[PDB]
Amino acid sequence: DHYELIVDGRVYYICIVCKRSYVCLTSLRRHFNIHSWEKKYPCRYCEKVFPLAEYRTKHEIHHTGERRYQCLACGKSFINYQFMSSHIKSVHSQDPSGDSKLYRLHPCRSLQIRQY
Template identity: 30%
Template sequence: CGECGKAFRWSSRLAHHQRSHTGERPYKCPECPKAFKGSSALLYHQRGHTGERPYTCPECPNAFKGSAALLYHQRGHTGERPYACPQCRKTFPHSSNLQLHRRTH
């Protein structure tokens, strides 16, 4: 990137990154005034309009717009706690939980 020096393996990733410097948002939602830097963000957003939730939980009836939300949800079923506090070793299912906890030390 000519602006910040960050390197990318793919030119498409560089183009997407450069939009963070220029503010360009070429992917426009046809349903509302919102616009996005990338096509995947637009697709995710459009699922809010259509109600589409293609990522279904195999353990319960819940479904989600994106795979990250499904993974976040599934940790409630599995009990996975991959984020550990380096000071006290307490573990958390999500990085945001760990960040909040670290403020207590």
């Protein structure tokens, strides 16, 4: 539940509770579950419950210890983008953020997500 804000040509969708704005309605619905708790996303490994599916997935990867992000310069693997990127910038003085091609994201094998 939202209202629309049209500014010179562009449409925005504004959340009725907290006023955040979204370029698409799908994002607003996804976000709104933080207010409504209509859907629940429980960790299958512990007691934590998450308002978004992606948050639970990232959390469950912490539990298994799977390292999907691999630096292609030296072979070292990392649990997420942030560690992969911080390693490449400090050790290799390169930005994985383009254009290059400096890391590999492996498929998730330690549990079953959608692939991709």
